[PDB]
């Protein structure tokens, strides 16, 4: 089977600058090599085919290139509309097999996260369940991590994490981090608390209730 | 111009079968070679399928070979997936795909994805709860808990609340799954207007409205 | 099958000018002369144009000729119809219809019909009452009163509530639409289940529900 | 212009019956009369062509006759399904042109209506209309005559009256009655009262309410 | 297969007139000859009448002659019954069965059967009246009484109840029918768990469901 | 017209015993007899045709035979599933005629009827009507004979009497008895008794209650 192996599965590039997308194979392709990108609700649009053809009202920013083992997309410069997720692909041997992607994002200027807690809401309580929330709203770059204390003791069973990916209004992510209680836990304890360790701030932030 | 579009994914029990459906239009169906590729929530995309137009010539990827056929209806422009022995890890949408761009062989045109889910988890409609909280603005948030198979849909005021939502990917925990929504609204005119979240689950028909009321 | 779609239906003002489109597919659409029909309010069917498979032989009723133009696009599987210095008379349903069936020629497949209303009245939203009144049933109601163009669709309890329900078609004064709807429940769960008239006007995009509560 | 004259336009049979409709044209035809038949909600469909020949999926229950001026649709015999409105056409030269339709109901036992009387709500009069509405339910036939009284005396200014068509539940009809008055008026006056003669009543039905 | 389904069955006075339908499928009806046979309620089968494939041949039993008249519309695959100058001993079950089986001709396909009673008698509802009474067993009744025209349907806990169940033929008197119908439920579980007897009658579209209720 | 005389109306045969049927012309016949099976709720359907060729799907156990005059439908050995009425039916000139029919029973062993009776419910009383009625259920053989007596005395006037068909779980009959009053002469007696004769019993079978 023709592996391919693209890399990295994740970059940021700053608007104005050149993207870099490769794509390897384990043995030699055309002229076989093509390129997808996928924006996020919609299906793959074929952009490259050949190894360096655009397709019908592909941008002249993007160029694809390369040779036997070795393949490339580059867009030069990135624009906003640019997020997606590419994909290489080869067309010369069945098994036809595709690389792993790679998430294209925008660089832009770090962001502290703006935290609010959520106590689980009357309703939540009385059908027994006990979800305390934080959000972490509108940060860059998208690396965090988030840790829940009860009483002050870190907690990391029934965590769950969400990011969402990439805004499209300010280029910045957040995400969601839920503790998952009992109510007949959640009333044995007094206060909860998320912390969160970003680039934008040495120490942690943190942010608390206690239950009442 | 070129149309394809597909049905009949959903949720099926491991072990089970299914059968999609892509119909095609504004070109010679019987022309074409056609693929279906397939994309898992972690994710990426994977062939699956070939049929040469004629359904003649016929290629499987490894991980399917003996469980899933690929055939085609030429007089009514459609091309199907016949999916048996359902695993897990074929939880994945669904793509049919046009092998054209002759003679630079391509899959140029693509359908728009039905989702399979094959799980032994059943359908359940979530939980809603509202979450509330100077600033100047306020933020509030939308709890959807306990539901399968996915998608939700998560508006707020029916849509008319657009910037400053965030709705996060589900997590799956316990067997169903979990996400949140957030918006963020005027702190001056809150609660005085009132602020609504909506959630829909499409798998089991469900539709949920509920109001964000304040507490200290 | 035979497939017919259309569309470009509205409100236009007298003398004011209108597109109509209607799609084929499932036959040969150069190969068939098709038919556009109206009908009006009060009512009954109306000739309107014809034009054959290769537009050469058109047709056009004494009260469109020179004011309507039938053409169509072969290429695209489009007839189409273009209305110029429209009259209130030209107030109708517009179907078109394949004239088939040979060789005893007959309009054999119809479209579903898209409306034409032509009117200086401008689009209103309407206003929406409830109507409250021993008996085992009790009978309630909803009044919709003050809209344009038609129509307006009713449901009671989001289309829950099915038999015993009655809508009444509209009625113009003053230049605006007025009708009522009538829904009969039980009167033992009467009001302590609650019943609701949901109201949308499709021309302004407008949606109304309204508690039907109880008074001496 | 071939005229075609279509009768009658309202046609109402008992279930097992025998329904006819007769299409005369003012000029002699085919071998070209068609019938289509239309439902509630939808497109006419094309039943007889020729003059006699039934389309695909049309029961035998339905049958065309007829030549030179004269045509006619008989169904023998009628069931509830086959309530609809009935058009002639000739397709044997333009202008084509069709007939004014019948609408064929069914008969069946007639049917008191029950009647309704609602007070303008306080939503409307807080807005300076006032509307008071009049429901007669479920009657048979569908003939009827609604007055309105203010205090003892006929109105006719201001009165909307509309009919369902036929109910696919029970065959039967029933009718809305609105009077529309300014608040202004409403207020002036104590008694308002529906009043509707019908096959089924020596006495006029009543209802009333006092304002308050 | 060969399908013959039929309708028109319903309620007249003497000397009225109804016309049966019977629809055709499965076979070239053009073809085939066919008849119509009744079944009175007591009973036994009897001959109506005949038409030849193209309508040319027809034939009468003598009791109907002059009054009845057989007819066919060979494009829309229908054949027709029609009925005049009714009498009570026209009330039966109508047939209608195809001239097959060549050339051994014999009725081979028959329809379903469409119900024709003639009577002076007007549609009424039934009343129907519960029964109730160690065993074990304990036997339930439901009475259903002075309906008109046949049939009423009978079920228990809306079909839950099976077996036991004895459900017997109406009998005429003063110019109604009445029948009853007995259920045998376990002795220790009544009435603490509800039983309830369920009729309807087809030719007034009344539903009525009656619980059984103690009494010493 | 070609009479057919159908014997016996009514016939019990045992599992695994032989039924016949026999059916004789009043002149003669092919060659044209036909038979016919009707099960409880459904259309005749067609048994033998000729006088003796089985039908598709006809078991085998199903024979006709006969010539000229005298013509037979044997079955053996009967079956649960052989309970219907059968028909003949002569195919040779226009009248074609049947015989009256046939209806087949599975003999079995005698039982008793079990016998409840029922006092009018309240809800007809209070309607002014008062029917008393007595079910005599899962019984064998089908003959049995029912009396009401009023007071100790026999009444016959206002008795409705039903048979149901052979039931298909156990063969046996039942039958319902209904004695109908008004509530004025219902009101004016004390005792209410159904009584019957069956093969099972040499005394009357008496179910009886006071009204209270």
């Known amino acids: 089977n023709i592996v391919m192996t693209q890399s990295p599965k994740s970059m940021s590039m700053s608007v104005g600058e050149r993207v870099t997308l490769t794509c390897?194979?384990?043995?030699?392709?055309?002229?076989?090599?093509?390129?997808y990108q996928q924006k996020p609700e919609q299906s793959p649009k074929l952009?490259?085919?050949?190894?360096?053809?655009?397709?019908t009202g592909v941008p002249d920013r993007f160029t694809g290139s390369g040779s036997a083992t070795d393949f490339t997309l580059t867009i030069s410069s990135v624009q906003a509309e640019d997020l997606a997720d590419?994909?290489?692909?080869?067309?010369?041997?069945?098994?036809?097999?595709?690389?792993?992607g790679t998430k294209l994002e925008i660089k832009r200027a770090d962001a502290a996260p703006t935290v609010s807690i959520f106590p689980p809401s009357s309703e939540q309580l009385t059908s027994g369940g006990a979800s305390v929330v934080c959000f972490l709203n509108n940060f860059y770059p998208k690396d965090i991590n988030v840790k829940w204390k009860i009483d002050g003791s870190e907690r990391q069973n029934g965590v769950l994490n969400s990011w969402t990916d990439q805004d499209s209004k300010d280029s910045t992510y957040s995400m969601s981090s839920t503790l998952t209680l009992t109510k007949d836990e959640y009333e044995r304890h007094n206060s909860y608390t998320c912390e969160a360790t970003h680039k934008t701030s040495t120490s942690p932030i943190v942010k608390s209730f206690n239950r009442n | 111009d070129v149309q394809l579009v597909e049905s009949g994914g959903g949720l099926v029990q491991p072990g089970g079968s299914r059968k999609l459906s892509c119909?095609?239009?504004?070109?010679?169906?019987?022309?074409?070679?056609?693929?279906?590729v397939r994309q898992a929530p972690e994710k990426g995309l994977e062939w699956?399928?070939?049929?040469?137009?004629?359904?003649?010539?016929?290629?499987?990827?490894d991980t399917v070979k003996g469980r899933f056929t690929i055939s085609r209806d030429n007089p009514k422009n459609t091309l199907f997936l016949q999916m048996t022995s359902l695993r897990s890890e074929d939880t994945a949408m669904?793509?049919?795909?046009?092998?054209?761009?002759?003679?630079?062989?391509?899959?140029?045109?693509?359908?728009?994805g039905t989702s399979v889910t094959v799980s032994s988890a059943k359908t359940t409609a979530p939980s809603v709860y509202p979450l509330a909280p100077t600033g100047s603005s306020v933020t509030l948030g939308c709890l959807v808990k306990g539901y399968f198979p996915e998608p939700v849909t998560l508006t707020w005021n029916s849509g008319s609340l657009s910037s400053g939502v965030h709705t996060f990917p589900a997590v799956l925990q316990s067997g169903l799954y979990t996400l949140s929504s957030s918006v963020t609204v005027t702190s001056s005119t809150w609660p005085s207007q009132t602020i609504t979240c909506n959630v829909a689950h499409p798998a089991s028909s469900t539709k949920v409205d509920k109001k964000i009321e304040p507490r200290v | 099958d035979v497939q017919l779609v259309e569309s470009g239906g509205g409100l236009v003002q007298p003398g004011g000018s209108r597109k109509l489109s209607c799609a084929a597919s499932?036959?040969?659409?150069?190969?068939?002369?098709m038919h556009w029909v109206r009908q009006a309010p009060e009512k009954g069917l109306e000739w309107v144009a014809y034009?054959?498979?290769?537009?050469?032989?058109?047709h056009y009723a004494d009260t469109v000729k020179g004011r309507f133009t039938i053409s169509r696009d072969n290429p695209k599987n489009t007839l189409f119809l273009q209305m110029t210095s429209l009259r209130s008379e030209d107030t109708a349903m517009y179907y078109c219809?394949?004239?088939?069936?040979?060789?005893?020629?007959?309009?054999?497949?119809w479209g579903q019909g898209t409306s034409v209303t032509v009117s200086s009245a401008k689009t209103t939203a309407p206003s929406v009452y409830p109507l409250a009144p021993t008996g085992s049933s009790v009978t309630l109601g909803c009044l919709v009163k003050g809209y344009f163009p038609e129509p307006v669709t009713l449901t009671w309890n989001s289309g829950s509530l099915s038999s015993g329900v009655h809508t009444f078609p509209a009625v113009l004064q003053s230049g605006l639409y007025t009708l009522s709807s009538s829904v009969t429940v039980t009167s033992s769960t009467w009001p302590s289940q609650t019943i609701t008239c949901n109201v949308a006007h499709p021309a302004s995009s407008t949606k109304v529900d309204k508690k039907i509560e109880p008074r001496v | 212009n071939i005229v075609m004259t279509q009768s009658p336009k309202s046609m109402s049979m008992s279930v097992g019956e025998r329904v006819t409709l007769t299409c005369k044209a003012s000029?002699?035809?085919?071998?070209?009369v068609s019938w289509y038949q239309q439902k509630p909600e939808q497109s006419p469909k094309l039943l007889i062509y020729?003059?006699?020949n039934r389309y695909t999926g049309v029961p035998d229950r339905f049958t065309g006759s007829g030549s030179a001026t004269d045509f006619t649709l008989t169904i023998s015999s009628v069931q509830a399904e086959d309530l609809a409105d009935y058009h002639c056409?000739?397709?044997?030269?333009?202008?084509?042109?069709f007939g004014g339709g019948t609408k064929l109901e069914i008969k069946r036992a007639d049917a008191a209506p029950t009647v309704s009387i609602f007070p303008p709500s306080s939503e409307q009069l807080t807005s300076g209309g006032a509307s008071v509405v009049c429901f007669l339910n479920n009657f048979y036939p569908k003939d009827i005559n609604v007055k309105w009284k203010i205090d003892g005396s006929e109105r006719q200014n201001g009165v909307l009256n509309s009919w369902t068509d036929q109910d696919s539940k029970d065959s039967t009809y029933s009718m809305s009655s609105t009077l529309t008055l300014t608040k202004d008026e409403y207020e002036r006056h104590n008694s308002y009262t529906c009043e509707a003669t019908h096959k089924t009543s020596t006495s006029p039905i009543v209802k009333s309410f006092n304002r308050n | 297969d060969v399908q013959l389904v039929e309708s028109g069955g319903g309620l007249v006075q003497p000397g009225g007139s109804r016309k049966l339908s019977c629809?055709?499928?499965?076979?070239?009806?053009?073809?085939?000859?066919?008849?119509?046979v009744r079944q009175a309620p007591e009973k036994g089968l009897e001959w109506?009448?005949?038409?030849?494939?193209?309508?040319?041949?027809?034939?009468?039993?003598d009791t109907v002659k002059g009054r009845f008249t057989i007819s066919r519309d060979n494009p829309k695959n229908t054949l027709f019954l029609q009925m005049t100058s009714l009498r009570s001993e026209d009330t039966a079950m109508?047939?209608?069965?195809?001239?097959?089986?060549?050339?051994?001709?014999?009725?081979?396909?028959?329809?379903?059967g469409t119900s024709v009673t003639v009577s002076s008698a007007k549609t009424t509802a039934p009343s129907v009246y519960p029964l109730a009474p160690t065993g074990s067993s304990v036997t339930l009744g439901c009475l259903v009484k002075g309906y008109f025209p046949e049939p009423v349907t009978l079920t228990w806990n809306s079909g839950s109840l099976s077996s036991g169940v004895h459900t017997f033929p109406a009998v005429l008197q003063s110019g109604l029918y009445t029948l009853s119908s007995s259920v045998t439920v376990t002795s220790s579980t009544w009435p603490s768990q509800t039983i309830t007897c369920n009729v309807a009658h087809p030719a007034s579209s009344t539903k009525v469901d009656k619980k059984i209720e103690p009494r010493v | 017209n070609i009479v057919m005389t159908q014997s016996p109306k009514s016939m019990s045969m045992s599992v695994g015993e032989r039924v016949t049927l026999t059916c004789?012309?009043?002149?003669?016949?092919?060659?044209?007899?036909?038979?016919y099976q009707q099960k409880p709720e459904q259309s005749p359907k067609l048994?033998?045709?000729?006088?003796?060729?089985?039908?598709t799907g006809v078991p085998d156990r199903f024979t006709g035979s006969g010539s000229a005059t005298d013509f037979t439908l044997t079955i053996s050995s009967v079956q649960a599933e052989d309970l219907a009425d059968?028909?003949?039916?002569?195919?040779?000139?226009?009248?074609?005629?049947?015989?009256?029919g046939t209806k087949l029973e599975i003999k079995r062993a005698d039982a008793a009827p079990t016998v409840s009776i029922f006092p009018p419910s309240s809800e007809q009383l209070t309607s002014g009507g008062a029917s008393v009625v007595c079910f005599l259920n899962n019984f064998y053989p089908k003959d049995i004979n029912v009396k009401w007596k009023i007071d100790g005395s026999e009444r016959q006037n206002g008795v409705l009497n039903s048979w149901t068909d052979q039931d298909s779980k156990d063969s046996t009959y039942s039958m319902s008895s209904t004695l109908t009053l008004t509530k004025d002469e219902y009101e004016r007696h004390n005792s209410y008794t159904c009584e019957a004769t069956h093969k099972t019993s040499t005394s009357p079978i008496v179910k009886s209650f006071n009204r209270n």
């Open positions: 020729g003059a006699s």
């Open positions: 000029e002699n035809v085919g071998t070209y």
């Open positions: 499932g036959f040969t659409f150069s190969s068939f002369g």
């Open positions: 034009i054959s498979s290769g537009s050469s032989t058109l």
């Open positions: 219809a394949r004239w088939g069936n040979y060789p005893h020629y007959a309009m054999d497949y």
């Open positions: 056409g000739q397709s044997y030269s333009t202008p084509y042109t």
